Amino acid sequence: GLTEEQRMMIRELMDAQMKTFDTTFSHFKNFRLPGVEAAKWSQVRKDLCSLKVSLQLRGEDGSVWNYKPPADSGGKEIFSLLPHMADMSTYMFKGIISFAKVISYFRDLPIEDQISLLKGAAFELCQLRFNTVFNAETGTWECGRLSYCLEDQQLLLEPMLKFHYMLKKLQLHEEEYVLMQAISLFSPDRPGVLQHRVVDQLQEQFAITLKSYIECNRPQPAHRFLFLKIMAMLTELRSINAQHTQRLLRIQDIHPFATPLMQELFGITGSL
Ligand SMILES: Clc1ccccc1C(c1ccccc1)(c1ccccc1)n1ccnc1
């Protein structure tokens, strides 16, 4: 029950996803690994505690490395995973940027608005892509030969983590994830967007396509209100990206770690 525009639209997004989402992370390599005042630090210590995972690395030859992070002993060991996480984020961001740049609706926008939309939505799209490799039975993001496991059920208090569990519960299709990415990418209200009305119209068409996709392919009474649930999750995603953004900026304030691409997306000038 989708129109021809809508069917073309979903195809173009699925195409962009297929070309730019390295789902086995095969080309994530050369990354760093952990080695072998006052009220800021209290806040940053709390910040880093929420971002805590163990790391497993499965060698192509069959070997396995496992890293268990330290406890907070009041020092600098709380920063040990930041260079690795910066490299993973950077790698995800490159995929996100490539995703946007092959979408016709995005390429047609002026360059400054392209940049403003990517700066506004990079994290959100990264989180949506991470959700598709999140294993909610083991609390593990399965990134090909890398796995990141939550240290350990009072962790669902963390809004990022509650989001991943709730979104995974909806059992979305690939098409529904990529429409979510599009709706978040084409948010007309990001800082610096000039063409508000053009982006808003595009956003509305992505949401209408999603509504129609669901109505036509999900008749089960379990998926009643699925569209509205998804849209409320998108609002939650925006809110937690703002929280997560401020958290990384606090951490970055006292222990620098953003790569140049992360700095670009943050608007960090390299000046002081
Ligand atoms: Cl992606 C990211 C960047 C910086 C810090 C933490 C995370 C995190 C993650 C995701 C996949 C693989 C390793 C870490 C992360 C890990 C644990 C707790 C919070 C965030 N992530 C961002 C959003 N959802 C998950």
Curated annotation (Swiss-Prot):
GO cellular component: chromatin; intermediate filament cytoskeleton; nuclear body; nucleoplasm; nucleus; transcription regulator complex
Tissues expressed in: Expressed in liver, colon and small intestine.
A GO molecular-function descriptor: nuclear receptor binding
A single GO BP: positive regulation of DNA-templated transcription
NR LBD domain mapped to chain residues: 5-270
The entry's keywords: Activator, DNA-binding, Metal-binding, Nucleus, Receptor, Transcription, Transcription regulation, Zinc, Zinc-finger
Compartment(s): Nucleus
Highest taxon of source: Eukaryota
Main subcellular location: nucleus
Residues at which hyperforin binds: 89, 127-130, 244
Subunit structure, as described in the record: Heterodimer with RXR. Interacts with NCOA1. Interacts (via domain NR LBD) with CRY1 and CRY2 in a ligand-dependent manner.
Entry similarity comment: Belongs to the nuclear hormone receptor family. NR1 subfamily.
Biological role stated in the UniProt entry: Nuclear receptor that binds and is activated by variety of endogenous and xenobiotic compounds. Transcription factor that activates the transcription of multiple genes involved in the metabolism and secretion of potentially harmful xenobiotics, drugs and endogenous compounds. Activated by the antibiotic rifampicin and various plant metabolites, such as hyperforin, guggulipid, colupulone, and isoflavones. Response to specific ligands is species-specific. Activated by naturally occurring steroids, such as pregnenolone and progesterone.
Name by which UniProt lists this protein: Nuclear receptor subfamily 1 group I member 2
Organism name: Homo sapiens (Human)
Gene: NR1I2
Complete-protein stretch covered: 142 to 434 of 434
